[PDB]
C-alpha cells in the first residue's frame, strides 16, 4: 500500500501578473498556472483511511496563507513578545482567488468521493487528482465564506463530538448570501445584510443534524459567543483590505419554537487587531474612503458545544484557528508517497 507522507506541495492558480490585487501578486511569484490538463483517476476496489484532523496539507496551506498575508498586508505597528516594530503600511487591493494544491513527482493526492464522508475512517470511493480543487483562502471566524457546499445535505464534522472542546465544522448544502458594506461617505461603521428566512431555515436544518448526532431527545439551542477576543466574539473577516468585526448575536440566538425580511448585523472596521498568524497585535491605518462592499456566500460554520445533563445542548459560534478553515475544504484530500 501507498503511505501518507509529507512533501513539498506546490500551488497553482489563475493569478494574473497585471493584477495588483495581493493574492494575485503572491500567487504570481509562488504558484504555477492552474493545471491545463487535470486528470482524475478512479482507484477501483480501493478503500483508504482518511483523517481530516491530521492532514499535513492543512499545515502547508496555513503557512502559505500566513506568508501571503505577511507579505501583502503590512501593519503600521506590530507588537509581538513585548517588542514593537513600525513600518510603512500602505492600503492594498484584497480579494482572495482560488488556489489549488498539487503533489510533485513521487507523490499523489488521494481524494475521497464518498457522499457525506465524515472526515475520518475508510473511504470506498477514492480517486487520485494532480491538484485539489480551487480553494479561496478566506480568513474569517464563525462563518465560513465562499467555500464549497456539501452535495446532498448538511454535514457536520468533529474530531470528537463527545468532546465539547472540539470544534464542529458545519458544511452547508445551500449558500446564504451575506452582503457587507461600509457606505460611501462614522468611517468605521458598517453592516451586513442577509435573508432572515434563509438563515432561520439554515439554523433549523443544522439543528436537525446536531440532533442526529447528540440524540433525538435533545433540545438544540444556539447562543452567542461566551466571550474572548473580539475576533472570535464577532464574525470577523477582511473585506477590501479592511478588517470587519460584525456583531453576530442575531445569527446565533435561536431555539426550535420560534418580523422583517433581512437580518442586519452591525459591524465595525477596526485598526487594532489580534493577529491570526502568530500571537500578537497589529495596527493598520484608517479605512479607505468610498463604498467598501463584499457579497459572500456563507457555505459553512464553526461551532462549539457547551460541556455538561440536562436534555439541552447549546451551540455557539467559534473558530479562531484558521486551520479549521482550510480543513473545511481539504477534508477530502491526503497526500501519499508512491512506493
Amino acid at each position: 500500500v501507498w503511505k501518507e507522507a509529507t512533501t513539498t506541495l506546490f500551488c497553482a492558480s489563475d493569478a494574473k501578473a497585471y493584477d495588483t490585487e495581493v493574492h494575485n501578486v503572491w500567487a504570481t511569484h509562488a504558484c504555477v498556472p492552474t493545471d491545463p490538463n487535470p486528470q482524475e483517476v478512479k482507484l477501483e476496489n480501493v478503500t483508504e483511511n482518511f483523517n481530516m484532523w491530521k492532514n499535513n496539507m492543512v499545515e502547508q496551506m496555513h503557512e502559505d496563507i500566513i506568508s501571503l498575508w505577511d507579505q501583502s498586508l503590512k501593519p503600521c505597528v506590530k507588537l509581538t513578545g513585548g517588542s514593537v516594530i513600525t513600518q510603512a503600511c500602505p492600503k492594498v487591493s484584497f480579494e482572495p482567488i482560488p488556489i489549488h494544491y498539487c503533489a510533485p513527482a513521487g507523490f499523489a493526492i488521494l481524494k475521497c468521493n464518498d457522499k457525506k464522508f465524515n472526515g475520518t475512517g475508510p473511504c470506498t470511493n477514492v480517486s487520485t487528482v494532480q491538484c485539489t480543487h480551487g480553494i479561496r483562502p478566506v480568513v474569517s471566524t464563525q462563518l465560513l465564506l465562499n467555500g464549497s457546499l456539501a452535495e446532498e445535505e448538511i454535514v457536520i464534522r468533529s474530531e470528537n463530538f463527545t468532546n465539547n472542546a472540539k470544534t464542529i465544522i458545519v458544511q452547508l448544502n445551500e449558500s446564504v448570501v451575506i452582503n457587507c458594506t461600509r457606505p460611501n461617505n462614522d468611517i468605521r461603521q458598517a453592516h451586513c445584510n442577509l435573508s432572515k428566512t434563509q438563515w432561520e431555515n439554515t439554523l433549523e436544518q443544522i439543528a436537525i443534524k446536531l440532533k442526529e448526532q447528540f440524540g433525538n431527545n435533545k433540545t438544540i439551542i444556539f447562543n452567542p459567543s461566551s466571550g474572548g477576543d473580539p475576533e472570535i466574539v464577532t464574525h470577523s473577516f477582511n473585506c477590501g483590505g479592511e478588517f470587519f468585526y460584525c456583531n453576530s448575536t442575531q445569527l446565533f440566538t435561536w431555539n426550535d419554537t420560534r418580523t422583517g425580511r433581512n437580518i442586519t448585523l452591525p459591524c465595525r472596521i477596526k485598526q487594532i487587531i489580534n493577529m491570526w498568524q502568530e500571537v500578537g497585535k497589529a495596527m493598520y491605518a484608517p479605512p479607505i474612503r468610498g463604498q467598501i462592499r463584499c457579497s459572500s456566500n456563507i457555505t459553512g460554520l464553526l461551532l462549539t458545544r457547551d460541556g455538561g445533563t440536562n436534555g439541552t445542548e447549546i451551540f455557539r459560534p467559534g473558530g479562531g484557528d484558521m486551520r479549521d478553515n482550510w480543513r473545511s475544504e481539504l477534508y477530502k484530500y491526503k497526500v501519499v508517497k508512491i512506493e
Partner: peptide, 27 residues
Amino acid sequence: XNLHFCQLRCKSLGLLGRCAXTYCACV
C-alpha cells in the same frame, strides 16, 4: 494564544480561558 492572560481575562468574566489558535476564547 497568550494563555495566561486569556485565563486571566476570562476568569474575570467568570469563565475558563482557552486558546483558539492565536486568539483567546472564553468557555
